[PDB]
Amino acid sequence: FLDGIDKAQEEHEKYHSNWRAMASDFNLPPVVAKEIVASCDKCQLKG
Amino acid sequence: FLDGIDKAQEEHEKYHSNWRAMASDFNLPPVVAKEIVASCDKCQLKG
Ligand SMILES: [Zn+2]
Ligand SMILES: [Zn+2]
């Protein structure tokens, strides 16, 4: 849970836009990937 | 993961405002509870 996020956590690069690639890379359900998107304000709030 | 969310998922009641109580109830890390908050637009977007 928290460990997977620490590694998955990273700069707001293009991988953030494609959360699926991150779930596929770590083979985790959209839940963990979605939570990271929700924590990143840039990915969550649009403008 | 998805199973825990299904049960934890519910109407936007007061429990949604207090995500901790939900994590304590199901003994899950803020990650799962936070993801539910991010999925609920009312809890995520404020106004
Ligand atoms: Zn981001
Ligand atoms: Zn809600």
PDB file of N, CA, C and O in Angstrom, chain A residues 44-45, chain B residues 40-47, unseen atoms left out:
ATOM      1  N   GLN A  44      -5.292  16.069 -10.205  1.00  0.00           N
ATOM      2  CA  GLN A  44      -6.697  16.163  -9.731  1.00  0.00           C
ATOM      3  C   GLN A  44      -7.311  17.459 -10.239  1.00  0.00           C
ATOM      4  O   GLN A  44      -8.100  17.458 -11.164  1.00  0.00           O
ATOM      5  N   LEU A  45      -6.958  18.573  -9.656  1.00  0.00           N
ATOM      6  CA  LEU A  45      -7.544  19.845 -10.146  1.00  0.00           C
ATOM      7  C   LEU A  45      -6.940  20.142 -11.511  1.00  0.00           C
ATOM      8  O   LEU A  45      -5.774  19.921 -11.769  1.00  0.00           O
TER       9      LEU A  45
ATOM     10  N   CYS B  40     -15.719  10.160  -5.019  1.00  0.00           N
ATOM     11  CA  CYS B  40     -16.954  10.944  -4.764  1.00  0.00           C
ATOM     12  C   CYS B  40     -16.678  12.395  -5.154  1.00  0.00           C
ATOM     13  O   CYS B  40     -15.870  13.071  -4.550  1.00  0.00           O
ATOM     14  N   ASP B  41     -17.318  12.866  -6.187  1.00  0.00           N
ATOM     15  CA  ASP B  41     -17.078  14.262  -6.648  1.00  0.00           C
ATOM     16  C   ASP B  41     -17.418  15.262  -5.544  1.00  0.00           C
ATOM     17  O   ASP B  41     -16.735  16.250  -5.360  1.00  0.00           O
ATOM     18  N   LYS B  42     -18.470  15.028  -4.818  1.00  0.00           N
ATOM     19  CA  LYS B  42     -18.862  15.982  -3.740  1.00  0.00           C
ATOM     20  C   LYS B  42     -17.769  16.078  -2.684  1.00  0.00           C
ATOM     21  O   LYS B  42     -17.468  17.146  -2.188  1.00  0.00           O
ATOM     22  N   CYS B  43     -17.175  14.981  -2.325  1.00  0.00           N
ATOM     23  CA  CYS B  43     -16.111  15.035  -1.293  1.00  0.00           C
ATOM     24  C   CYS B  43     -14.852  15.632  -1.911  1.00  0.00           C
ATOM     25  O   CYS B  43     -14.093  16.323  -1.261  1.00  0.00           O
ATOM     26  N   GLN B  44     -14.627  15.366  -3.168  1.00  0.00           N
ATOM     27  CA  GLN B  44     -13.416  15.914  -3.834  1.00  0.00           C
ATOM     28  C   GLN B  44     -13.647  17.381  -4.160  1.00  0.00           C
ATOM     29  O   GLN B  44     -13.140  18.260  -3.489  1.00  0.00           O
ATOM     30  N   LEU B  45     -14.415  17.670  -5.175  1.00  0.00           N
ATOM     31  CA  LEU B  45     -14.660  19.097  -5.494  1.00  0.00           C
ATOM     32  C   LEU B  45     -15.531  19.684  -4.394  1.00  0.00           C
ATOM     33  O   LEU B  45     -16.435  19.057  -3.877  1.00  0.00           O
ATOM     34  N   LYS B  46     -15.194  20.869  -4.000  1.00  0.00           N
ATOM     35  CA  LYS B  46     -15.888  21.555  -2.874  1.00  0.00           C
ATOM     36  C   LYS B  46     -17.013  22.481  -3.336  1.00  0.00           C
ATOM     37  O   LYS B  46     -17.999  22.652  -2.649  1.00  0.00           O
ATOM     38  N   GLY B  47     -16.847  23.136  -4.439  1.00  0.00           N
ATOM     39  CA  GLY B  47     -17.890  24.101  -4.873  1.00  0.00           C
ATOM     40  C   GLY B  47     -17.314  25.025  -5.946  1.00  0.00           C
TER      41      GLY B  47
END
